[PDB]
Design a protein around this ligand. Structure first.
Ligand code: FAD
Length: 385
């Protein structure tokens, strides 16, 4: 009755936790030496002391009811974050007024006022993390918390409860269905055998040519409409507690914010998120990272950034175990194609943020997807027996 789960992100850990509770025997393969995947919490030293920062996923939003259930069971608390003018809203209203096609095709229909149109384009590109020329126009249609002590405390606790079932330092390279039943999971070192497997790997990993996973023409047809969002997290220390804030940069395609932690004080950390691959390339975070600090300092003259400060950068696009930040939708995504993506191929099931139909791309979606896959696996094992 052996189940193999590939990836110890929220999707894989949620699948494994539900299967463990059902009394099944699970093994979780994780390439990193930590759980959580794109949930990754660390501390940043500042002149006021050390503060938790989110190098990946940050905000728990309204409606994250599966994650809230898990936080309750693992004893973890949510902390309120405490967080040109309006012309972008009106311009987006005119935009809608004019859901087929791409956002850019709709922006092209607006009166040709380029700085204002580009301000709206930037808002779209930051949040969808893709070019406006590729994302569905339906994205134009579109209070917060963080986990006390770091969002990664949740996957940390889920993994800890699975104990020796979680196998770190294991890089999956192939997954093969066997005709008479069962699955072979091959890492860089050796192969294991399972009755069923849940692939809970990133979108970019399951589409990577360096891995041999089960595929079908129907899946390939649905996957081609799922875009890879790209984003980088950036953090700077501050010399004193600021007000809470949220301030966007049009030219840089990034957002900055300052937020309260469990103490009730606003942490002296400038948090930042840059979205869309062309923005990250224009920023040149790897080569000349003082440039972005200079831009951030100019954007946020109200914040006291030390003069010799260097940004902490987390460019998930360059991590072969992530390959981007989250999924986005091209115009051609359908509910039926999205549903297809979680159906098994042989005895190989699937979970991840990219196949969630409502909370697409979010921590809540990864959890919900993992828990759906666990339910499908339990039906398959009931069948095999
Ligand atoms: C910068 C950034 C900001 C975000 N902001 C938010 C936010 O504010 N709120 C929100 O809800 N969501 C946000 N997210 C999205 C959220 O991080 C994801 O939806 C979610 O964490 C994805 O979980 P997953 O389990 O699907 O994938 P992952 O977390 O990527 O887990 C997949 C796992 O597979 C492992 N792995 C990869 N390749 C292999 C291999 N070959 N063999 C074995 N293991 C392998 C990885 O190491 C990883 O542990 C953000 C993401 C990023 C990157």
């Amino acid at each position: 009755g052996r189940i193999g789960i590939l990836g110890a992100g929220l999707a894989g850990l949620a699948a494994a936790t539900k299967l463990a509770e059902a009394g099944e025997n699970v093994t979780v393969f994780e390439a990193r030496n930590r759980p959580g995947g794109r949930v990754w919490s660390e501390t940043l030293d500042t002149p006021k002391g050390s503060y938790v920062i989110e190098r990946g996923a940050e905000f728990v939003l309204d409606g994250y009811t599966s994650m809230r259930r898990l936080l309750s069971q693992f004893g973890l608390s949510l902390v309120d974050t405490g967080m040109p003018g309006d012309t972008t809203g009106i311009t987006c209203d005119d935009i809608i007024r004019t859901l087929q096609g791409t956002a850019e095709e709709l922006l092209a229909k607006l009166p040709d006022e380029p700085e204002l149109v580009d301000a709206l384009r930037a808002r779209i590109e930051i949040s969808t993390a893709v070019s406006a020329s590729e994302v569905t126009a339906r994205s134009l249609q579109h209070p917060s918390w963080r986990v006390a002590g770091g969002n990664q405390r949740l996957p940390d606790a889920m993994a800890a409860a699975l104990g020796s079932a979680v196998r770190y330092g294991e890089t999956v390279r192939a997954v093969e269905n066997i005709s008479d039943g069962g699955v072979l999971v091959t890492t860089d070192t050796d192969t294991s055998v399972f009755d069923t497997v849940v692939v809970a790997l990133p979108l970019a990993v399951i589409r990577d040519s360096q891995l041999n996973l089960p595929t079908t023409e129907a899946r390939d047809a649905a996957l081609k409409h799922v875009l890879q969002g790209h984003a980088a997290k950036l953090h700077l220390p501050l010399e004193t507690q600021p007000a809470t804030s949220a301030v966007m940069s049009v030219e840089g395609r990034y957002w900055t914010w300052t937020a309260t932690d469990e103490s009730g004080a606003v942490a002296p950390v400038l948090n930042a998120f840059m979205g869309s691959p062309s923005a990250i390339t224009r920023a040149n975070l790897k080569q000349r990272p003082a440039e972005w600090v200079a831009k951030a300092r100019a954007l946020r003259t109200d914040l006291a950034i030390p003069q010799d400060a260097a940004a902490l950068t987390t460019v998930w696009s360059e991590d072969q175990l992530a390959g981007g930040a989250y999924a986005a939708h091209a115009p051609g995504v359908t509910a039926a194609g999205t549903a297809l993506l979680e159906k098994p191929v042989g005895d190989v099931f699937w979970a991840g943020e990219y196949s969630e139909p409502e909370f697409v791309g979010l921590m809540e979606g990864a959890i919900r997807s993992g828990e759906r896959a666990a339910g499908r696996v339990m039906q398959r094992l009931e069948t095999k027996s």
